[PDB]
Amino acid sequence: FIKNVKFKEQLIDFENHSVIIETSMQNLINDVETVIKNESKIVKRVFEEKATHVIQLFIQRVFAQKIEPRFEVLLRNSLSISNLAYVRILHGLFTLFGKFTKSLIDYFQLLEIDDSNQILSTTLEQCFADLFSHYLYDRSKYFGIEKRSLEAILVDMTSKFTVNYDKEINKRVLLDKYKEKLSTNTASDIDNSPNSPANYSLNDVDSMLKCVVESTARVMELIPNKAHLYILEILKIMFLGIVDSYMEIALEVAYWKICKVDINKTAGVVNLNFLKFISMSTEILDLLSISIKSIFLPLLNNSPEIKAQIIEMTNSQIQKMEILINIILQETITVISTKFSAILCKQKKKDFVPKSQELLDQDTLPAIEIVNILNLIFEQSSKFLKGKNLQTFLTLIGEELYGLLLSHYSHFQVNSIGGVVVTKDIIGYQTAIEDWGVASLIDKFATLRELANLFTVQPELLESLTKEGHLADIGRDIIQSYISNREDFNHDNFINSVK
Amino acid sequence: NWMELNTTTGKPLQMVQIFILNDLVLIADKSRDKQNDFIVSQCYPLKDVT
Amino acid sequence: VLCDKLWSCIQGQTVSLYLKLYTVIDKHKNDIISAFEE
Amino acid sequence: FNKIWGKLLDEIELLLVRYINDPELISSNNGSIKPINGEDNSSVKDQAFELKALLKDIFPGFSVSSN
Structure with a gap:
């Protein structure tokens, strides 16, 4: 009749089983263990049959004495504290029933009778299974309410993990209700880094892996062979917590960083969001992918419905979450692509619509908006961000910078000496986009560099400089008319070449 | 009398009599098959038993 | 019509709100729920 | 039912055995x-979580x- 003393709880941290209290019935279990050896020797002498009634009615009087009163009292008190408290301490409580049960296995070996070493031993283990059966595995109390308090501690310690990232860095629509609800069917925070979430920083995935793989191990080793079903249940609750609450909540955190998608001349809230989604990729995708892979290799016992946890749970979260992040890297690719494309070509009618056919060959808003838009966009994080997408961030975001070179550098619409201003400002961006963090532009913006020396077709430098190597990035009949992308095309008979 | 172990988790499995015959193996869970008539025959031939 | 599944049920199980919340009061004081339930 | 989905079983199990007659003797x-x-x-x-x-x-x- 204990009154649930402190403390109770001090045990709900992101770790294994924890602080007070004993057990204090392992006191009573040791007392029944040496009392068991005592009446074992005494009734071993003073009886005729052996299991009768020591194993028969005095093990029955043991659990009827102890496990009825003291252990259902312990369920009343441990459950009277909380649920996940008595879930983990039910794993420890019944694990202690397996401890003292194994002490009745070695203490059973202190006995020396074969039918007692038959299921009369497992009658004591069967009354241990009766103490199991008061909170039986056959109900959803021992597993599904253990999964329910495991969802309490799961959404508690995991959903509120990355606290200001989960709730909130957005409304949160955050392109998950906007882009994935449209395409697969903008300032949101500012401005440092992947700073809990992503992921967070793999430590929340070590927290959710810690407690969730902890109690997953606890109900795993604790419960009977009906385990792979609940392994798909709670593993699918990790598909809730990680493939949905950290691919689409704590990476909707990262998609609140990709709420700076469509970031045309808005590359400051995507100057801290390259590392945020890049570390969702690195920590969340790398850590959750290899950790869920090798952890899932242990978790699959022998079933072929376990392959439905391989393909449809895990690998379809790699293809589905691949559709999450890479399409948000397609619309984040539209954020950097609209950034350098719209913002870097946004020079006025003296640079990007220049008629300066014999002067103004220098740097301008092509250099300032190329180095500012791109080199403030991707040379802020994405130069040092994703190596988890190394050739994808560098070679593909820089390959879209080469696409942005086709929108800003090879699409700088300036005249016969303004093309030379593209040969000092967009060729002044060709090396600079190759240092802007999206840095694959040393060959196709360098094609826009020779095209920039081709886009300066005046009446003395129009034929063979436009007929250079990468000056065929100017048009096939628009080599001499390479400044037909300008106000004035090519200064008195642009089109005397194709015939 | 090999009380078997759950090989993955390292916990115990059910018990099994080990019946090593001349050229075939009967790793049989005789529980609660107290015979030894039709016990649970984890069986194969010895010529490719590893 | 539809509150009979929803709120006329609650107008037929009104005290059964606190009575049904008392089901957790024996298994595992009573002021802030059974007096000011809003 | 074990014809109605008996034959829906076996005609499935041969059909994929069609598609895995790939050109190798697969x-x-x-x-x-x-x-x-x-x-x-x-x-x-927990050492496997720390192995992760x-x-x-x-x-x-x-x-x-x-x-």
């Missing part, structure tokens, strides 16, 4: 299913992610 006896990324103790599972922490620094972890 022999179809592997069963590995890998995603996009290629014990015997109590706390060894050893995987948290492994390798970079580098991959490709573009569209």
